Amino acid sequence: SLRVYVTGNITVDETWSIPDIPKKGASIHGVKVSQDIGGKGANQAIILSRCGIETRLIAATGNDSNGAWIRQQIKNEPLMLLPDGHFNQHSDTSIILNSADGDNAIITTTAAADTFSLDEMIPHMADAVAGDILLQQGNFSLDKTRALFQYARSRGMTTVFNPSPVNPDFCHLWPLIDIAVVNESEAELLQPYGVKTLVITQGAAGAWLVQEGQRQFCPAVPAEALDTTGAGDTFLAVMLASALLRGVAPDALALAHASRAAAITVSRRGTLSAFPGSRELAALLT
Amino acid sequence: LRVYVTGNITVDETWSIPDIPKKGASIHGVKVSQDIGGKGANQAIILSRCGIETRLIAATGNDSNGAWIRQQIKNEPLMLLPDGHFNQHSDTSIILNSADGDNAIITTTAAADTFSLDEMIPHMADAVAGDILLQQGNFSLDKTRALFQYARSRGMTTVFNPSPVNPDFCHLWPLIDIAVVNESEAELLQPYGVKTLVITQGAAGAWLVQEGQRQFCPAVPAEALDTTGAGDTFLAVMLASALLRGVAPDALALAHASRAAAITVSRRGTLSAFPGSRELAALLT
Ligand SMILES: Nc1ncnc2c1ncn2[C@@H]1O[C@H](COP(=O)(O)OP(=O)(O)OP(=O)(O)O)[C@@H](O)[C@H]1O
Numbered sequence: 001s002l003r004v005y006v007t008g009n010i011t012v013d014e015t016w017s018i019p020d021i022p023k024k025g026a027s028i029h030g031v032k033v034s035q036d037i038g039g040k041g042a043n044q045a046i047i048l049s050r051c052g053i054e055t056r057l058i059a060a061t062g063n064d065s066n067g068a069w070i071r072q073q074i075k076n077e078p079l080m081l082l083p084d085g086h087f088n089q090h091s092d093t094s095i096i097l098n099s100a101d102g103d104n105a106i107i108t109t110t111a112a113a114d115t116f117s118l119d120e121m122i123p124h125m126a127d128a129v130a131g132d133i134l135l136q137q138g139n140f141s142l143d144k145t146r147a148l149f150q151y152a153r154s155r156g157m158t159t160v161f162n163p164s165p166v167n168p169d170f171c172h173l174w175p176l177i178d179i180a181v182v183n184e185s186e187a188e189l190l191q192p193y194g195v196k197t198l199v200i201t202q203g204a205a206g207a208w209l210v211q212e213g214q215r216q217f218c219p220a221v222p223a224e225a226l227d228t229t230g231a232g233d234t235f236l237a238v239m240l241a242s243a244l245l246r247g248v249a250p251d252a253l254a255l256a257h258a259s260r261a262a263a264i265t266v267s268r269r270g271t272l273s274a275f276p277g278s279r280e281l282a283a284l285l286t
Numbered sequence: 287l288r289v290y291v292t293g294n295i296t297v298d299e300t301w302s303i304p305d306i307p308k309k310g311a312s313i314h315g316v317k318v319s320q321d322i323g324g325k326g327a328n329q330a331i332i333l334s335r336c337g338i339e340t341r342l343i344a345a346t347g348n349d350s351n352g353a354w355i356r357q358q359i360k361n362e363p364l365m366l367l368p369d370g371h372f373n374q375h376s377d378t379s380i381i382l383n384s385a386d387g388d389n390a391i392i393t394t395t396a397a398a399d400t401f402s403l404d405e406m407i408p409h410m411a412d413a414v415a416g417d418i419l420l421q422q423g424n425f426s427l428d429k430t431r432a433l434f435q436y437a438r439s440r441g442m443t444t445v446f447n448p449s450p451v452n453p454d455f456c457h458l459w460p461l462i463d464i465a466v467v468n469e470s471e472a473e474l475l476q477p478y479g480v481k482t483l484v485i486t487q488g489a490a491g492a493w494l495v496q497e498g499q500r501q502f503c504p505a506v507p508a509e510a511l512d513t514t515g516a517g518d519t520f521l522a523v524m525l526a527s528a529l530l531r532g533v534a535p536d537a538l539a540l541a542h543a544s545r546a547a548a549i550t551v552s553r554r555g556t557l558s559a560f561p562g563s564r565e566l567a568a569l570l571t
């Protein structure tokens with residue numbers, strides 16, 4: 001019965017296949033092979049909703065084709081996307097998949113998130129109550145991010161923070177955070193301190209649960225790294241859902257469930273079509 | 287005299303980036319605009335705006351972009367064929383605009399690829415000796431060559447703009463009457479034996495190469511806010527000017543083309559940046 005409010009972003013990740021990245025002045029032919037709903041905010045909110053946690057995703061969409069697509073595709077998930085309607089412009093990433101070329105090149109836009117204001121968001125947490133969670137990633141400016149956590153604090157909400165993309169100035173918000181989820185680089189760069197619950201993820205190398213002075217390690221679940229997209233979002237969402245469903249603060253079992261869920265995501269390609277499904281989640285959380 | 291253009295039509299999206307990303311890197315970008323475009327559509331639309339009877343043979347998809355494209359084209363004095371659309375996404379182009387150098391473009395071809403050669407040719411059924419077939423580099427070697435061979439069999443004049451470039455296009459010159467290329471294409475495809483050869487060089491003008499003679503036409507100074515479609519504008523207006531005066535492309539045609547392309551570079555977008563019918567008329571007189 002505790003609910004989760006996620007204030008972050010939502011995008012369209014477009015996978016384009018090309019022989020090689022074109023040089024300036026060049027013009028080539030390519031293939032728009034696929035599109036998937038993306039964004040750390042949306043991925044985390046969607047997976048949380050699939051675990052049976054009543055979740056509200058507060059993110060902005062624009063008035064373009066990708067916007068309508070997002071609003072249409074999100075209806076397939078047991079999540080509520082606020083606000084309805086839209087703004088203008090539109091977050092998404094073009095994933096340039098080359099041929100002989102090794103790694104992909106990524107170009108990402110953030111206009112919708114950068115413009116989404118506090119007066120647009122706060123109203124959608126009007127029905128929040130003490131105990132409810134405000135989950136935030138690193139898609140907003142320091143001022144907006146800090147302001148949202150202060151709002152949560154003034155309502156008695158629990159604050160969860162996953163500072164990714166990283167922002168050096170995020171190292172000042174720790175006092176406003178109840179639960180921190182960071183990967184290795186983030187843990188060393190932001191130096192989270194005094195956070196009552198600290199989780200440090202290290203990919204296929206497992207994760208650490210830290211803070212009642214106690215340090216606990218949870219190995220990753222062996223898996224075929226076919227596509228790691230959203231592995232971190234999966235881990236965070238399931239860890240939180242597990243703790244919520246059992247009525248406790250994140251613990252060792254929460255991390256074990258999360259590792260198991262992330263293992264599924266890594267084994268499948270894409271986002272929504274790769275993440276564990278509601279029944280798969282029900283089974284592992286059991 | 288009628289001009290048949292067999293090529294593509296798209297929705298162009300312009301992304302502003304610091305510089306083209308390296309393999310394995312994730313960079314930030316900003317979507318600046320979306321507009322109607324396509325090598326085929328751009329050239330056909332401008333020709334039609336100049337008063338040239340033009341027919342664009344290109345495929346649109348059954349998506350929102352397709353409906354938008356068809357709606358926009360309806361406002362132009364051009365005939366788009368076929369009337370119906372195909373069960374495919376309409377073709378689109380990603381224009382990567384870096385703060386420094388020239389734009390990089392990536393264009394899809396799924397819609398154009400569905401429009402088979404057997405389906406396209408019937409749209410030229412009413413062509414007559416003297417009419418023109420204008421093509422760009424949207425199609426494969428085989429498809430492009432087949433259309434030019436068909437044109438030749440019907441006594442039509444052929445115009446070729448090998449863009450996007452395809453290494454194999456170098457084997458097509460004997461079928462080409464008028465060739466328009468930029469400096470990169472000229473070296474890459476080595477045009478030869480073409481009655482009329484035009485080599486464009488951006489802000490540095492364009493060369494007209496005919497029967498041994500070479501003439502240089504300087505560019506009209508302009509503030510380059512958006513260079514997208516500059517080449518298409520130049521080709522279209524040059525061809526239109528010659529056609530209107532009933533001559534082979536000449537120095538005056540390139541001068542007209544230069545003035546038109548300057549307008550295009552001074553404006554933002556694709557279709558929205560092109561000179562309008564009245565501007566073109568005043569320009570051509
Ligand atoms: N190859 C893998 N095999 C099994 N589990 C994995 C693998 N990669 C990631 N995970 C699981 O997912 C958790 C999420 O991890 P990681 O620290 O890479 O996330 P992240 O850096 O936030 O993700 P992202 O690349 O999206 O930013 C890991 O601790 C692990 O349990």
Ligand SMILES: Nc1ncnc2c1ncn2[C@@H]1O[C@H](COP(=O)(O)OP(=O)(O)OP(=O)(O)O)[C@@H](O)[C@H]1O
Pocket residue numbers: 449467468469486487488489490491492504505506507508509510513514515516517518520543544547548551
């Ligand atoms: N910056 C500029 N200022 C004035 N005129 C220009 C400028 N850039 C291009 N032009 C005009 O447009 C003609 C079209 O030129 P350019 O050689 O860049 O074409 P292109 O390489 O085919 O471009 P694209 O295919 O991307 O439209 C030039 O010869 C010139 O007359």
